[PDB]
Amino acid sequence: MKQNINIGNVVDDGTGDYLRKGGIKINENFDELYYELGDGDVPYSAGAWKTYNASSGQTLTAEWGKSYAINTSSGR
Amino acid sequence: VGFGFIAITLLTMFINVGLTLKHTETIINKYKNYKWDSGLPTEYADRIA
């Protein structure tokens, strides 16, 4: 959501990096996203394929959504 | 023989503090450290067991 570190750069051999410090940053970057949408997600675009497979209960529980079946055989 | 002559006291401690302060040993140790610049190593050594 755009507040994150740049985490240093490769110019020549050079110096200024943080040279392995950036984890505490690198974490926040990941820690931005996996928590920015964190308790939730987008169900629709990935919630399509699967149920083209069997009718089995196919748990979507307690986040997103899963089974669109996009094809025959019982729809699940 | 004609003057009063009374006695009074004064005390001088002369605390000697300021011994030692010898700076002991000064110690420094170099680092190979890691920045995101980095680049090509020359071979490797150790690195795990």
From Swiss-Prot, chain A:
Cellular compartments annotated: Virion
Induction entry: Expressed in the late phase of the viral replicative cycle.
Family: Belongs to the T4likevirus baseplate wedge protein gp10 family.
Chain's role: Peripheral baseplate protein that is part of the tail fiber network. Connects the short tail fibers to the baseplate. During infection, the baseplate undergoes a conformational change from a dome-shaped to a star-shaped structure. At this point, gp10 rotates and acts as a lever that unfolds the short tail fibers, which then interact with host cell surface receptors. Involved in the tail assembly.
Binding partners and assembly: Homotrimer; disulfide-linked. Heteromultimer with gp7; a gp10 molecule is disulfide-linked to gp7 and the other two remaining gp10 molecules form a disulfide bond. The gp10 trimer interacts with gp11 trimer and with the short tail fiber (STF) composed of the gp12 trimer. Part of the baseplate macromolecular complex which consists of gp5, gp5.4, gp27 (central spike complex); gp6, gp25, gp53 (inner baseplate); gp7, gp8 (intermediate baseplate); gp9, gp10, gp11, gp12 (peripheral); gp48 and gp54 (proximal region of the tail tube).
Record-given protein name: Baseplate wedge protein gp10
Swiss-Prot record, chain B:
The protein's name: Baseplate wedge protein gp7
Similarity comment text for this entry: Belongs to the T4likevirus baseplate wedge protein gp7 family.
Function: Intermediate/inner baseplate protein. The gp25-(gp6)2-gp7 module is involved in sheath contraction. Involved in the tail assembly.
Superkingdom of the source species: Viruses
Origin organism lineage: Viruses, Duplodnaviria, Heunggongvirae, Uroviricota, Caudoviricetes
Localization (cell): Virion
Subunit structure: Heterotrimer with gp6; assembles as a (gp6)2-gp7 heterotrimeric molecule. The (gp6)2-gp7 heterotrimeric molecule further interacts with gp25 and gp53. The gp25-(gp6)2-gp7 module is involved in sheath contraction. Interacts with gp8. Binds to gp10 homotrimer; disulfide-linked. Heteromultimer with gp10; a gp10 molecule is disulfide-linked to gp7 and the other two remaining gp10 molecules form a disulfide bond.
Residues included from the entire protein: 886 to 934 of 1032
Species this protein is from: Enterobacteria phage T4
